[PDB]
Design a binder for these strands. Structure first.
Lengths: 121, 140
DNA sequence: GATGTTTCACGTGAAACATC
DNA sequence: GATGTTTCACGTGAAACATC
């Protein structure tokens, strides 16, 4: 089987009519099956390693936030900015309610976020 | 003939694999033949009227600059920023040599205006000197 | 070396002017 | 009303950090 097949498939992920989350799952599945690094994918598609990483990180977002991405109520920039936040769904609602830019959203994330319990001695 | 045909063709200009100049000529040709305004195209493709105008304005650039756009040595932002300049080809060379951002390119364009079309038209010099004209020689 | 994450420079597209 | 042009806000993608 010709090696060029893998390269063409990876190349055409970004050239196809895929939303950001469809591109993410594509890269993840291809990295796994063809056993390729974030760095290898990046060099293949002519992008940065962090771009590949940040794209796939979006798959970890709660389904409510992913729904906003698909519907276009949030952009990829908004979603990524709240990805490592305590309550991304709360922040998502604030972004849509307030009409926040990605820059304003980054500011919100900076200025926002538990006891494991056990019998008291 | 169904009217929806024109709309689909206009819609798919931006969805096709066209460089900025191919998109420009498409819009121009379609505006002409279907007798539609910049405003009508804009509303059809879900963009601004100025976006449609600025896109087509790029067709007026010298062939040398258009070549840089096609080759990717310049972006649409660079090309548009020098479109109303006296010598766009000179500016194009400076942008590529210096690796100037579009913001830096806009700054260059401000401080080298096309308003240098105040060139002397010539003409036989009159018998009576014309004092004011003679005095504007030094300052110019 | 591989990957997680944040901050900001960039070109693109639009607002804010202009003329005719 | 239609169109020419300039300036700048925006999201995207990358640099500059981090851990393991």
């Amino acid at each position: 089987m010709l090696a060029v097949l893998e390269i063409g498939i990876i190349e055409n992920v970004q050239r196809a009519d895929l939303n950001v989350l469809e591109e993410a799952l594509s890269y993840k599945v291809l990295m796994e099956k063809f056993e390729r690094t974030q760095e290898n994918i990046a060099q293949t598609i002519g992008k940065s390693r962090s771009h590949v990483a940040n794209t796939m990180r979006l798959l970890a977002l709660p389904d409510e936030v992913q729904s906003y991405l698909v519907s276009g109520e949030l952009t990829a920039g908004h979603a990524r900015a709240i990805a490592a936040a305590a309550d991304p769904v709360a922040l998502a609602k604030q972004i849509i309610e307030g009409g926040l830019s990605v820059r304003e959203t980054e500011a919100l994330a900076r200025k926002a976020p538990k006891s494991k319990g056990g019998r008291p001695p």
